Every structure is written in structure tokens, then in C-alpha cells.
């Protein structure tokens, strides 16, 4: 219902969206464009990394999980710098920067 109506943005529907990708997909189907019970890409993209930074998404020591969160929200610079710090994934982060360049 609230995937069709883009409502109840605060309720993460955790009963059915238990994975991270299920959350991203749940919200990107809820973002809106031009006051209550409404979320926009700017709020969502900022809300995610500002409040729930790397710390929240890298506790499982899985780096790509956070990268996908930033890249699939149009925050390409964040995801590039972030992934560029993983000494094992420097190569990959430089190139995804070149492509964007």
C-alpha cells in the first residue's frame, strides 16, 4: 500500500524489508519531488550517511554494502572516497572515479 502510495516513510516495513537492498528499494519507491509524511532524495541521501554513517553500514566488515548505499543514492563522490580508503579496493575506487570523470 505505501509502496504504491509512497506513505509511512518512517515505517521501514522491517517485517518484509529485512535486507539492506530491500530498504533502499523500499525508500526509493517512497521518495517524492515537490510537507508531512514525505521524503525527498536530498533528505534521504543526506539522512542516510549523516545520521547512519560508515559506522552503521560497516559493522559487519562488508565494504561494498556501504558503497552500494552511496552509489545507488547518487552520492558518487562519497562512495568513491569511501571505497578509495579500503587498501584492498583502491584500484576499483579510482576507476569508478575515472568513469564518472
Amino acid at each position: 500500500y505505501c509502496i504504491i502510495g509512497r506513505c509511512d516513510v518512517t515505517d521501514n516495513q522491517s517485517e518484509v524489508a529485512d535486507k539492506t537492498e530491500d530498504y533502499l528499494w523500499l525508500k526509493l519507491n517512497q521518495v517524492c519531488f515537490d510537507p508531512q509524511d514525505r521524503l525527498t532524495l536530498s533528505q534521504f541521501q543526506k539522512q542516510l550517511l549523516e545520521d547512519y554513517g560508515e559506522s552503521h553500514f560497516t559493522v559487519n566488515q562488508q565494504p561494498f554494502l556501504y558503497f552500494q548505499v552511496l552509489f545507488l543514492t547518487a552520492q558518487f563522490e562519497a562512495a568513491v572516497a569511501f571505497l578509495f580508503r579500503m587498501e584492498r579496493l583502491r584500484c576499483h575506487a579510482v576507476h569508478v572515479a575515472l568513469v564518472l570523470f
Partner: peptide, 8 residues
């Protein structure tokens, strides 16, 4: 309260 469990 988003989960941190990656789709595996």
C-alpha cells in the same frame, strides 16, 4: 532503523 545485513 535500516538493517545492515547485505543480501547474500
Amino acid at each position: 532503523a535500516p538493517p545492515v545485513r547485505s543480501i547474500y
